[PDB]
Amino acid sequence: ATMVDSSRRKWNKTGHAVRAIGRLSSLENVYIKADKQKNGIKANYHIRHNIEDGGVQLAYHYQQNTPIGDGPVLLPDNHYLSVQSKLSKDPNEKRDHMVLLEFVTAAGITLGMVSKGEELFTGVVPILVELDGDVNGHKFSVSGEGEGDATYGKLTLKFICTTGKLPVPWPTLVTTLVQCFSRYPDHMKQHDFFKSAMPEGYIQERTIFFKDDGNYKTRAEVKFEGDTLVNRIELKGIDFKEDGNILGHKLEYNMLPDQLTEEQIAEFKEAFSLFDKDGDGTITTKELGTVMRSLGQNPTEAELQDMINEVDADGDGTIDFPEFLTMMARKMKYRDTEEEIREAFGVFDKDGNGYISAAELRHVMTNLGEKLTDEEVDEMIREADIDGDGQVNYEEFVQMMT
Ligand SMILES: [Ca+2]
Ligand SMILES: [Ca+2]
Ligand SMILES: [Ca+2]
Ligand SMILES: [Ca+2]
């Protein structure tokens, strides 16, 4: 009957499981740490900008926040911000523009274990943004207006390029263009520097390294002026390639509609079930170990804890079905690097011969769950065997994992 409508099914499951472990092994949030010397905080993270004709552009950020004021501030223990960005266009806007929607929430400190400034953020606060830029001598300016609602960690902003054509891609300016609007949970309110610095505010400084291209250097004043929260930025860009991804405008805007098909949910539910061995709706360290062990890895308890904590929204110490859904949705929106895809291929290519033998694919899926037979196995191979060789190579593998 159909080997094909259930080998395509069996493929996704294992593809998703391998991509999910790749994710739990990555550091994708905004890592915050105290900076006693500057009476402030440091941050590091990376941004993925999908390249227009396939590929991903990485942007490594190093951040520094210092209060403008003499007054006391909250110095956090290490935690992270978890961000969802949505970029759109206003259908009635003739000028070069960007509509930004962001949901930001603090996490990273488990349940197993406030400020004067917070007062100013209980309602909806109007925001004003102003940037002067210079990238490789190409100047530009951006003006922004919108609103913040820290109760939900929601931000909404509309930007106009006041100088005409923006010489860099809009996505590259998202992080530059108000972390005081994050939602800190009740258990973590004492770790919120941003709000604690208000109304006098902070200086935000960053260096952003676009891999294989130039960098930005930003300096920003984030403070209240009346009952408006204001962000005034200066950006300087050097060492860009004229033909490159940034100056050459080769980055995607914002593709994939923010919401998932009842079909994609089901696709991810199949994957989720590979880990949720006991069908309780949540993935424990024990469960993650089993999966990893059966993929050849051998992690410590500490590692397992860390992995979970990358995506553990509620701090319970486990990955619940919703948290899994968020994680997978995000992993689907942003492209993986060469190295990441290489790692994924190595799960399968046990001998390291550069070739996924039908033999090796059977081994994998055995150890994982499935009761696949040498007939279904064969059918999978055939589906993305571009060069008819009877084995899957790197290039082949890249297409099979989309
Ligand atoms: Ca479970
Ligand atoms: Ca959880
Ligand atoms: Ca092999
Ligand atoms: Ca082949």
Author numbering: 45 to 157, 170 to 233, 237 to 461
Pull text from the paper.
Indeed, the GCaMP6s-BrUS variant, while maintaining a relatively high molecular brightness, demonstrated an extremely short mean fluorescence lifetime with a low sensitivity to calcium. For GCaMP6s-BrUS, it appeared to be weakly sensitive to the analyte concentration, slightly decreasing (from approximately 750 to 500 ps) with the calcium concentration increasing from 38 to 350 nM (2–7 mM [CaEGTA]). In GCaMP6s-BrUS, it is primarily controlled by the R389 residue.
Since the permutation procedure in the original GCaMP6s involves the deletion of a 4-amino-acid fragment (corresponding to positions 145–148 in the parental protein), and, thus, the removal of the 145th amino acid residue, which is an important structural determinant of the fluorescent properties of BrUSLEE, we engineered two variants of the construct, with (GCaMP6s-BrUS) and without (GCaMP6s-BrUS-145) the M145 residue.
